[PDB]
Protein backbone atom coordinates (compact mmCIF):
# COMPACT_ATOMS: atom_id res chain seq x y z
CA UNK A 1 0.00 0.00 0.00
CA UNK A 2 2.79 2.28 0.77
CA UNK A 3 3.98 1.73 -2.91
CA UNK A 4 0.65 3.22 -4.30
CA UNK A 5 1.79 6.02 -2.54
CA UNK A 6 -0.97 6.04 0.18
CA UNK A 7 -0.69 8.37 3.17
CA UNK A 8 0.94 6.77 6.39
CA UNK A 9 -1.97 7.58 8.47
CA UNK A 10 -3.94 5.38 5.82
CA UNK A 11 -1.51 2.52 5.71
CA UNK A 12 -1.88 2.59 9.42
CA UNK A 13 -5.40 2.43 9.25
CA UNK A 14 -5.41 -0.67 6.82
CA UNK A 15 -2.97 -2.84 8.72
CA UNK A 16 -5.45 -2.39 11.92
CA UNK A 17 -8.03 -3.80 9.47
CA UNK A 18 -5.78 -6.57 8.96
CA UNK A 19 -5.74 -4.96 5.34
CA UNK A 20 -2.46 -6.58 3.97
CA UNK A 21 -2.04 -6.76 0.42
CA UNK A 22 -3.93 -4.57 -2.46
CA UNK A 23 -6.23 -6.45 -4.71
CA UNK A 24 -5.77 -5.49 -8.88
CA UNK A 25 -8.38 -2.87 -9.08
CA UNK A 26 -6.81 -0.95 -6.30
CA UNK A 27 -3.00 -1.10 -7.90
CA UNK A 28 -4.76 0.01 -11.24
CA UNK A 29 -6.82 2.66 -9.66
CA UNK A 30 -4.93 4.69 -6.51
CA UNK A 31 -2.32 6.28 -7.98
CA UNK A 32 -4.54 7.85 -10.60
CA UNK A 33 -7.03 8.39 -7.74
CA UNK A 34 -4.26 9.98 -5.94
CA UNK A 35 -3.37 11.90 -9.05
CA UNK A 36 -6.77 14.05 -9.55
CA UNK A 37 -7.69 12.15 -12.44
CA UNK A 38 -10.76 11.15 -13.60
CA UNK A 39 -11.88 7.50 -13.12
CA UNK A 40 -14.03 5.01 -15.55
CA UNK A 41 -13.93 1.53 -13.64
CA UNK A 42 -15.53 -1.01 -15.30
CA UNK A 43 -15.70 -3.92 -12.49
CA UNK A 44 -18.03 -6.52 -10.93
CA UNK A 45 -20.91 -5.39 -8.82
CA UNK A 46 -21.01 -4.51 -4.75
CA UNK A 47 -17.95 -4.16 -2.32
CA UNK A 48 -15.06 -5.62 -3.82
CA UNK A 49 -13.94 -2.56 -5.35
CA UNK A 50 -14.96 -0.04 -2.97
CA UNK A 51 -10.77 0.24 -1.78
CA UNK A 52 -10.29 1.50 -5.06
CA UNK A 53 -11.90 5.11 -4.90
CA UNK A 54 -12.44 4.68 -0.46
CA UNK A 55 -8.78 3.99 0.48
CA UNK A 56 -7.48 7.22 -1.25
CA UNK A 57 -10.65 9.56 -0.60
CA UNK A 58 -9.58 9.18 3.15
CA UNK A 59 -6.37 11.45 2.85
CA UNK A 60 -8.23 13.83 0.47
CA UNK A 61 -10.98 14.46 3.04
CA UNK A 62 -9.42 14.00 6.43
CA UNK A 63 -9.10 17.33 8.99
CA UNK A 64 -11.35 19.16 6.43
CA UNK A 65 -14.60 21.02 7.64
CA UNK A 66 -18.52 20.37 5.75
CA UNK A 67 -18.80 17.62 3.27
CA UNK A 68 -16.05 17.07 0.91
CA UNK A 69 -17.41 13.65 -1.20
CA UNK A 70 -20.58 12.59 -2.39
CA UNK A 71 -20.86 8.86 -3.31
CA UNK A 72 -23.89 7.76 -5.13
CA UNK A 73 -25.30 4.07 -4.93
CA UNK A 74 -28.44 2.22 -5.56
CA UNK A 75 -29.63 1.33 -2.60
CA UNK A 76 -29.96 1.26 1.14
CA UNK A 77 -27.98 -1.65 1.48
CA UNK A 78 -24.90 -1.11 -1.01
CA UNK A 79 -24.28 2.77 0.49
CA UNK A 80 -24.68 1.05 4.47
CA UNK A 81 -21.96 -1.13 3.28
CA UNK A 82 -19.74 1.16 1.03
CA UNK A 83 -20.21 3.85 4.81
CA UNK A 84 -19.00 1.21 6.42
CA UNK A 85 -15.54 0.14 4.19
CA UNK A 86 -15.13 3.84 4.63
CA UNK A 87 -14.53 4.13 8.25
CA UNK A 88 -12.60 1.10 7.97
CA UNK A 89 -10.14 2.70 5.64
CA UNK A 90 -10.11 5.71 7.87
CA UNK A 91 -10.53 4.07 11.16
CA UNK A 92 -8.41 6.44 14.11
CA UNK A 93 -8.44 9.16 11.73
CA UNK A 94 -11.72 10.87 12.79
CA UNK A 95 -13.40 10.99 9.39
CA UNK A 96 -16.95 11.57 9.57
CA UNK A 97 -19.23 8.93 7.42
CA UNK A 98 -22.80 10.06 7.09
CA UNK A 99 -25.72 7.50 4.99
CA UNK A 100 -28.79 9.50 3.54
CA UNK A 101 -31.34 6.91 1.67
CA UNK A 102 -35.08 7.23 0.44
CA UNK A 103 -38.22 5.26 2.23
CA UNK A 104 -36.64 7.63 5.99
CA UNK A 105 -38.05 9.89 7.66
CA UNK A 106 -35.74 13.02 6.46
CA UNK A 107 -35.42 14.89 10.21
CA UNK A 108 -32.55 12.20 11.26
CA UNK A 109 -30.56 12.53 8.37
CA UNK A 110 -31.09 16.47 8.54
CA UNK A 111 -29.31 15.93 11.80
CA UNK A 112 -26.47 13.92 10.75
CA UNK A 113 -25.77 16.05 7.76
CA UNK A 114 -25.55 19.70 10.27
CA UNK A 115 -23.14 17.82 12.08
CA UNK A 116 -20.82 18.10 9.16
CA UNK A 117 -19.70 14.88 7.95
CA UNK A 118 -16.79 14.54 5.55
CA UNK A 119 -18.36 11.82 3.19
CA UNK A 120 -21.83 11.60 2.31
CA UNK A 121 -22.93 7.96 0.97
CA UNK A 122 -26.52 8.18 -0.29
CA UNK A 123 -29.17 7.16 -2.65
CA UNK A 124 -30.26 9.23 -5.75
CA UNK A 125 -33.36 10.36 -5.03
CA UNK A 126 -32.87 11.41 -1.40
CA UNK A 127 -29.57 13.19 -2.49
CA UNK A 128 -31.67 15.40 -4.23
CA UNK A 129 -34.12 16.25 -1.69
CA UNK A 130 -31.52 17.16 0.55
CA UNK A 131 -29.66 19.33 -2.07
CA UNK A 132 -32.54 21.10 -2.92
CA UNK A 133 -33.51 21.85 1.02
CA UNK A 134 -29.51 22.97 1.49
CA UNK A 135 -29.02 20.54 3.92
CA UNK A 136 -26.71 19.29 1.89
CA UNK A 137 -24.19 21.91 0.78
CA UNK A 138 -22.54 21.59 -2.41
CA UNK A 139 -19.17 23.78 -1.97
CA UNK A 140 -17.13 21.65 -0.52
CA UNK A 141 -17.77 18.32 -2.69
CA UNK A 142 -14.22 18.03 -4.39
CA UNK A 143 -14.59 13.97 -5.11
CA UNK A 144 -18.12 12.73 -6.57
CA UNK A 145 -18.45 9.28 -7.00
CA UNK A 146 -21.18 7.10 -8.80
CA UNK A 147 -20.70 3.00 -7.44
CA UNK A 148 -22.62 0.69 -9.65
CA UNK A 149 -24.46 3.13 -11.86
CA UNK A 150 -25.89 1.18 -14.22
CA UNK A 151 -27.72 -0.37 -11.38
CA UNK A 152 -28.54 3.23 -10.39
CA UNK A 153 -30.42 3.42 -14.18
CA UNK A 154 -31.97 0.35 -13.34
CA UNK A 155 -33.72 1.52 -10.23
CA UNK A 156 -34.54 4.54 -12.12
CA UNK A 157 -32.50 7.08 -11.23
CA UNK A 158 -30.63 8.46 -14.78
CA UNK A 159 -32.27 11.71 -14.41
CA UNK A 160 -31.20 12.34 -10.50
CA UNK A 161 -27.63 11.80 -11.81
CA UNK A 162 -27.76 14.11 -14.13
CA UNK A 163 -29.25 16.54 -12.07
CA UNK A 164 -26.92 15.70 -9.25
CA UNK A 165 -23.48 15.86 -11.43
CA UNK A 166 -24.86 19.20 -13.29
CA UNK A 167 -25.76 21.01 -9.63
CA UNK A 168 -22.25 20.32 -8.02
CA UNK A 169 -19.62 22.51 -9.44
CA UNK A 170 -16.85 20.42 -11.86
CA UNK A 171 -13.99 23.05 -11.86
CA UNK A 172 -12.44 21.68 -8.66
CA UNK A 173 -14.34 18.38 -8.62
CA UNK A 174 -12.63 14.91 -9.28
CA UNK A 175 -15.26 12.41 -10.81
CA UNK A 176 -15.36 8.75 -10.88
CA UNK A 177 -17.81 5.73 -12.10
CA UNK A 178 -17.87 2.67 -11.47
CA UNK A 179 -20.59 0.04 -13.59
CA UNK A 180 -20.30 -3.59 -14.53
CA UNK A 181 -21.58 -2.42 -18.16
CA UNK A 182 -22.27 0.72 -19.93
CA UNK A 183 -26.04 1.76 -21.39
CA UNK A 184 -26.00 4.00 -23.69
CA UNK A 185 -27.21 6.51 -20.87
CA UNK A 186 -24.62 6.24 -19.08
CA UNK A 187 -22.23 6.93 -21.68
CA UNK A 188 -23.72 10.54 -22.06
CA UNK A 189 -22.85 10.71 -18.49
CA UNK A 190 -19.52 10.35 -18.86
CA UNK A 191 -19.38 12.81 -21.89
CA UNK A 192 -21.25 15.77 -20.55
CA UNK A 193 -19.83 15.51 -16.79
CA UNK A 194 -16.65 13.58 -16.66
CA UNK A 195 -13.04 14.97 -17.40
CA UNK A 196 -11.06 12.67 -19.70
CA UNK A 197 -11.59 9.78 -17.52
CA UNK A 198 -8.46 7.02 -17.11
CA UNK A 199 -10.24 3.56 -18.29
CA UNK A 200 -9.68 0.79 -15.01
CA UNK A 201 -10.96 -2.98 -15.99
Given at each position: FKELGISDNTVQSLESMGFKEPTPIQKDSIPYALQGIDILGQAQT????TGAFGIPLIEKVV??????SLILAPTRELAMQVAEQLREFSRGQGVQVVTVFGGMPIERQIKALKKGPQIVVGTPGRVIDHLNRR????????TLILDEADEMMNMGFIDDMRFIMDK????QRQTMLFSATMPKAIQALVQQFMKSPKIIK
Open positions: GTGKGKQGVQTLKTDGIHIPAV
